[PDB]
Amino acid sequence: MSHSLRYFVTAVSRPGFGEPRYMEVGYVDNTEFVRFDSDAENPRYEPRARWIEQEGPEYWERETRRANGNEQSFRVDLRTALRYYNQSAGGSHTLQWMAGCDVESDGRLLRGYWQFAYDGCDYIALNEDLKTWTAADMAAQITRRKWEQAGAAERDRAYLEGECVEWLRRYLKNGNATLLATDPPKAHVTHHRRPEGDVTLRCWALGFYPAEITLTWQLNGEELTQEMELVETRPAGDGTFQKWASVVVPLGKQQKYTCHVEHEGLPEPLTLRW
């Protein structure tokens, strides 16, 4: 499991405020490099990273039409949504598109993606086998059918495997310096000796990349969850990231709980304590 090209899309039906806000975001690992925010002066595809900027006019243009077109197809979807739900014409909503490909170091994608979400819940998604859909709610059921006969997956599958994998290695091969740069976390626990007879150890993990990580605590070997506390992986801005997990402990056990840090940059899973 190594690299990916993930494209994030959001259609936001803002009733009365005009046509839904449409936006596309391009990703490789945890890096936004391209964007398309409907509400813009020059509505071209934006180079949201310097490395991609090497791409010619043929690219940005060949992409603008891509986005702009999709915006229209979404408009339809949004409109059609209400119908499928008897919902008020004056109600706002969101249609989310998440399509990408997780390609392995050698070169073969480990997984292709093409999924949907209306507002927040999963709507319909192209399964693991890359050849079949999934219907969350009854609405999606219509779609699975619609898409089955039309052979919608076939058209997609060849992208995730095609231009996705094909453009992935290129986006990397021409901007790998800027990209790749893997960083390990520099963890360490803190010990707040607050009153109430209970002290809490906080295990931070900083300066890492990729963002994707895993962090935990182990009390004398015992795994613990319904007691732990972990903040979302917040970005450090400087290409790096931060994060942490905390566990309350009775003032006097301390040596009994230990934090774990697993990350690509790390050789073995980092175990520590206070």
Partner: peptide, 10 residues
């Protein structure tokens, strides 16, 4: 390159 809703709606 990004994917495209191939005008294959809901």
């Amino acid at each position: 390159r990004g994917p495209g809703r191939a005008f294959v709606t809901i």
